[PDB]
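The passage that follows is intended for readers who have already worked through the single-chain material. We present the inputs for a multi-component assembly, then the predicted structure in tokenized form, and finally a short commentary. You are encouraged to pause after the input and sketch how you expect the pieces to fit together before reading on.
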Amino acid sequence: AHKKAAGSSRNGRDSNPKMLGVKIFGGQAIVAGNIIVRQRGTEFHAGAGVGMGRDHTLFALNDGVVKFATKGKFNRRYVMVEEA
Amino acid sequence: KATLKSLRETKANPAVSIFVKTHREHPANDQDPIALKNQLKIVEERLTNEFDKRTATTILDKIHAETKEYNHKYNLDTLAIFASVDDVQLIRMPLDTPERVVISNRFATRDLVRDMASAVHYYTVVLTRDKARLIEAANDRVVAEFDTDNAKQNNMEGIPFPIDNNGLYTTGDGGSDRSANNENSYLKEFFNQVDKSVQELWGEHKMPLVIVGDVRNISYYKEVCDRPENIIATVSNLTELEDGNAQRIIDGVQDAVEGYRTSLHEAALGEIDKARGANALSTDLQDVYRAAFQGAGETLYVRRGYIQAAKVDEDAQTLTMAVTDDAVGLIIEHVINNGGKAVFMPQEMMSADQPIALVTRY
RNA sequence: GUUCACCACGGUGUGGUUGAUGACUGGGGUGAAGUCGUAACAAGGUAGCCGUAGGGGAACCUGCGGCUGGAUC
RNA sequence: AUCGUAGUCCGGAUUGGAGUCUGCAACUCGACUCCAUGAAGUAGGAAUCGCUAGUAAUCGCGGAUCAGAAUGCCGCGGUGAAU
RNA sequence: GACCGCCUGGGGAGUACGGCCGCAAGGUUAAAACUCAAAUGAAUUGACGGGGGCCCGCACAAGCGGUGGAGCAUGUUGUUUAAU
RNA sequence: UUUUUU
RNA sequence: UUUUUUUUUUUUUUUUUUUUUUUUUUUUUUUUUUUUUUUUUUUUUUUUUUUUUUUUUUUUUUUUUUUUUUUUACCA
RNA sequence: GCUGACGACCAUAGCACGAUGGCACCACCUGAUCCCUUCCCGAACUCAGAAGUGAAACAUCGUCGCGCCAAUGGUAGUGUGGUUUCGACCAUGUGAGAGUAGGUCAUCGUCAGCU
RNA sequence: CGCUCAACGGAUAAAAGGUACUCUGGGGAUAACAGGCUGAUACCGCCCAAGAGUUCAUAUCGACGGCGGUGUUUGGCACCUCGAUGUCGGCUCAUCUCAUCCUAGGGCUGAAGCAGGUCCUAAGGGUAUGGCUGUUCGCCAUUUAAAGAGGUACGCGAGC
RNA sequence: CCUCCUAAAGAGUAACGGAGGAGUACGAAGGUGCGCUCAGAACGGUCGGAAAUCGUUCAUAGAGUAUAAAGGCAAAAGCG
RNA sequence: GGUUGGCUUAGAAGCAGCCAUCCUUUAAAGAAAGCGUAAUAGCUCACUAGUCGAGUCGGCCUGCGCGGAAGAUGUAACGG
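Having made your guess, compare it with the prediction:
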């Protein structure tokens, strides 16, 4: 092992996947209760027709069509459920 | 001013150089005070004879103010005193010189010149089946040990010293069996890696190296060395290669270092012969002095204790036989001052019939 | 002349005695204002000394017997 | 009479200012005077000194040296113990 | 007076070596080189004793007041200076 | 009871 | 190498819990002494191996390196 | 024409600088009895009011100083098929970012009030 | 409500070792030898030229760096062989390579001569015996024109 | 078990790959209503300074978020 | 030709190194591009004039080539 080089650096940990991301994309039919976005924080904000859970899950409050839009003064990404 | 780089530049008048043979052990050093007294006696008498009594008295009181606290139980081989009208500098030397007094413009520094010309700076590679060490050694002292806290090992592409033999066979893994009898090959490759580190370090300094170790280890290393011409000595009777300290190792290599210095002095004879054949060697004291004073001599070869008094004048460039107390000292001073080299050859290698030679530049 | 006998040289072996040397080691002596202590000389601060044994860096200590070449009594 | 136990109406160093003398001359480097300031110091560790009676302790007053410059030296008396 | 033993400067040394004796510890017989001008005995005069006896002094004890802590005066050391 | 040295 | 143990005053050793640095021996100055010991009084004295890091605050918590000890480093 | 409320939109809408505005409106403003305020404070919140002023704020207007937006062309990358000296290249389909020219001192809706 | 059942889907409430005295079933699914792949390391070569060489980079040597060749050291991998491919050294007997040790031909030289140093060509032959140690090697003694470097299952145990 | 990367712009995705955390805390640090806005810098100011508290002016957050990291956070999810 | 430019250095004279690149006779001639000397010396070069007489010089890019290029049973690195 001639040059004293190889040695202890123990990091072989990693957490399990969380399966986040957009579940229902823009223009899709949706029924009330369907989860649209699983996220950490409000990467997307609930507009009209969609609510937010305690883990920032966005879900449909009513039936319709999912719409994504950027709006407001903060240029926030919003997801809406339009009655279409 | 305790150095050769200050004694040659302090050009006083009168400049008195006194040399006393001293002894390191008791009761040999019992007669060191008497020797000092006798040398100061002749110093006083000559100073009064050649100069005025007032200038002898000031110099002698200055010498006495420095020699009154001298401890003769800590004497080296020689006690040199360099006195002036204003300053006195006494130094102890491990060189042996013949007791004498030189009164001149400059301080008699040929013994310092000889001591500095005998200087050998070298590497010590200490080998073992389990490890390698590297020491830098000047003459008889260790300069450095080449451990973890060094600058010379900071940017290294090889294994830094001290190098452990962490071979797969030494730890018992790796893919080899003892019934294969690969141990000699393993030792050879380990010593090859050791030589790689040695060459990497030597490229930045380029000094000769002494190989210390078992006879078999030295053998393997010599067969594996990438620059075996730079090896000057091999010692195989040095003890405690792994635990003993660097000073102990350097103490144990001193016999081989002295043999190396002797070999260099033997080699100087061939260059003297080449100059003699090329008609560029002067051996008469007059010719040697003239060439040295006019800066024609590049190498001087003295016979290590060839003192000679003469009448020297730097107007007609003449040197008549006896005055200057050390005409050879003046020749050495001129050769060194004009950018030459001085070599103090041993008595058994330079004949007493021709005790001085000068290889000239033309 | 030959042969045998005696025998000098010389040879072989194995011892004895003794000179010079020998890594290393034991003590003795000399040499400086060295280090450690203070054992003895005063009752020397535990009287000392003799034999002997054990012990201890070192003078020494301790036991057993002996002596006075022991002061104070 | 007052102060009434306080770093004070204790202590008087140090510093600022203004002067008087002596002396050719007071910056280095004099002594006094005045005003202002007001420092440490609240009884002193280990240790250690003098004293047996007009003594110790305490209080002043002189002199030599000396133009000026004693808290030192040499003397004088006052009060005056303990053991 | 008879016979026997022993000494011949101090160390080295009652040691070494060799014998003999001893289980051993050791004993016994017993050198040399070298080294030093002394080493010793008895007595004398002193001095000294963590020897004895007797005695004195602010020596202690019994007391009074201090010094050692502060500031200042003065002297010394050390340091510093051209010199202190 | 505990006083080493020069 | 690996796993543990640690690194602090002159030395050898204590801490520590995030809110601080310790005995002892020294060393320096005193004092006793004819003078030195001994002894007695005073004192001084810590980048807490280094280096990132966390904290308002770290010698202390994390991480790295570096000395130290140990204990291991085996089968052909 | 202007002002205020609520919105669309979320910098070509912003910042900076300058000018205009007090008849309505708005804002400062006056006072602190009362409602209600202050871990203290009539600062803010609140109430009761019109002596003053458009100073500040605000609104509007002006500009290119900053910001912001931003082509065209080219380049990089890239799906598929092929080749390759493994850098890439060819055919086909796509095609940035940066940068440049340039643009920008917004545009609209509902209601009320003064003119 | 009671688990560092933390080997965290938790075998039992309850549990360490040794075997060179060993044994069975298997594996070239997987190590030790040798082959293969690779070439980091190694060895050899070349490029640049700071410097040393008294002057003078390039007679000789070549710092800092760069680029290759070989398979050749130390390694990496686990492809072959575990219904067996015997390990080191010696002996005997070899065979090949050339990066040449001697002998042969050369250029340069800090080549006067004698001796060398480097590099080019060259593989036809030749290329010690002993002391120590199991040694290969290595050191040492004495030689020789020289005592070459390697490959061949680190050639060769159905040859010892 | 959690966070980031590897992970090739949906998800998922391995290595004895590269980096860090967890095995809790809290009856308020939960609910609601109401209210508020941070860090830093400069200037002025008693002790008081580089930095305490006070006043002013800039300041989309360069702070905070019980804790690792990521993603979020002005209707603040931050602070009373 | 000033002139061995100055400095430095034993010596540094165009030519170890450091600091300028000036002037003069000029058709031209560097305070010198090399060899050389211990240093000078010496031999060349740049440059100019003459002779001859027609094309010539050196960089850049691109294609294909050359050297760099040594191995082990036998050619043995187009299968022949």
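Commentary: The radius of gyration of chain A is 20 Å. The longest strand of chain A covers residues 64-71. How closely did your sketch match?
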